[PDB]
C-alpha cells in the first residue's frame, strides 16, 4: 500500500474496509475516474 | 489500460453482465480533475458514530497536506449509502 | 432470430474486447522485467 | 427499448474491423516473447 494518508484517513471514518481492496478502490480515482461513477461500480458489484 | 486491469483485478476480492459492461460505465475526461463540493463531506461525519473527533481531528490534519486524491475519496465514503457491504467483505479476507 | 440474442450478441462481442484487452497488459509488464 | 438497427450495424463493424486489430499486436508482441 504505502498510501498512509489516504488509507489512514478512510479506516477511521469507515470504520473498516477490505486493505487490499482500498489499495485498488483509490487506484481507480488517481487515474482520474468520476467519483460517482465509481460509488456506482462499488454499488453495483453488491 | 491500467483501468481495465483494476476492474478484473476488483472483480476478484469482488469475487461475489458485471464484469465487461461494468467496464463501460466508466467514462471521464483524460487528464482533467473534477472538484466536489466539500458539503456531502459534513453529512458524512455525523453518520458514523463511531469516533465524535477522531474522524475529524485526523481529516483536516491530512487537509493540511495537499493530496491529489484527497477531495473524491471524502465524496467516496459520504456516497457509501449501502450499510455494512463493504465491511462485510473484508472480514472474509482476514480470515 | 429472437430479438433476444440480437443484443446478445453485442455482449458476446464485448466480452471478447475485455477479456483480450487484459491479456495484453500482462504480456506488457514481463516486456518490462525481462529487460 | 428498441435497437436502431442502423447504428447497430456501423457499431458491429467498428467493433469488428477493430478487435482483430487488436490481436494482430499480441501475437507478434508475443512471438517476439518467444524470439
Same mark, same amino acid.
Given at each position: 500500500?504505502?498510501?498512509?494518508?489516504?488509507?489512514?484517513?478512510?479506516?477511521?471514518?469507515?470504520?473498516?474496509?477490505?486493505?487490499?481492496?482500498?489499495?485498488?478502490?483509490?487506484?481507480?480515482?488517481?487515474?482520474?475516474?468520476?467519483?460517482?461513477?465509481?460509488?456506482?461500480?462499488?454499488?453495483?458489484?453488491? | 489500460?491500467?483501468?481495465?486491469?483494476?476492474?478484473?483485478?476488483?472483480?476478484?476480492?469482488?469475487?461475489?453482465?458485471?464484469?465487461?459492461?461494468?467496464?463501460?460505465?466508466?467514462?471521464?475526461?483524460?487528464?482533467?480533475?473534477?472538484?466536489?463540493?466539500?458539503?456531502?463531506?459534513?453529512?458524512?461525519?455525523?453518520?458514523?458514530?463511531?469516533?465524535?473527533?477522531?474522524?475529524?481531528?485526523?481529516?483536516?490534519?491530512?487537509?493540511?497536506?495537499?493530496?491529489?486524491?484527497?477531495?473524491?475519496?471524502?465524496?467516496?465514503?459520504?456516497?457509501?449509502?449501502?450499510?455494512?457491504?463493504?465491511?462485510?467483505?473484508?472480514?472474509?479476507?482476514?480470515? | 432470430?429472437?430479438?433476444?440474442?440480437?443484443?446478445?450478441?453485442?455482449?458476446?462481442? +464485448? +466480452?471478447?474486447?475485455?477479456?483480450? +484487452?487484459?491479456?495484453?497488459?500482462?504480456?506488457?509488464?514481463?516486456?518490462?522485467?525481462?529487460?
Amino acid at each position: 500500500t504505502e498510501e498512509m494518508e489516504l488509507y489512514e484517513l478512510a479506516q477511521a471514518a469507515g470504520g473498516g474496509i477490505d486493505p487490499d481492496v482500498f489499495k485498488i478502490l483509490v487506484d481507480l480515482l488517481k487515474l482520474n475516474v468520476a467519483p460517482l461513477a465509481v460509488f456506482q461500480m462499488l454499488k453495483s458489484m453488491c | 489500460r491500467i483501468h481495465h486491469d483494476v476492474n478484473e483485478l476488483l472483480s476478484l476480492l469482488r469475487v461475489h453482465a458485471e464484469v465487461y459492461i461494468d467496464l463501460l460505465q466508466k467514462n471521464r475526461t483524460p487528464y482533467v480533475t473534477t472538484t466536489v463540493s466539500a458539503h456531502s463531506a459534513k453529512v458524512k461525519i455525523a453518520e458514523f458514530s463511531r469516533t465524535p473527533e477522531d474522524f475529524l481531528k485526523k481529516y483536516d490534519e491530512l487537509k493540511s497536506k495537499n493530496t491529489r486524491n484527497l477531495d473524491p475519496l471524502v465524496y467516496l465514503l459520504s456516497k457509501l449509502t449501502e450499510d455494512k457491504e463493504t465491511l462485510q467483505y473484508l472480514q472474509q479476507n482476514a480470515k | 432470430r429472437n430479438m433476444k440474442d440480437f443484443e446478445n450478441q453485442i455482449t458476446e462481442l +464485448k +466480452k471478447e474486447n475485455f477479456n483480450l +484487452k487484459l491479456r495484453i497488459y500482462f504480456l506488457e509488464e514481463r516486456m518490462q522485467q525481462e529487460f
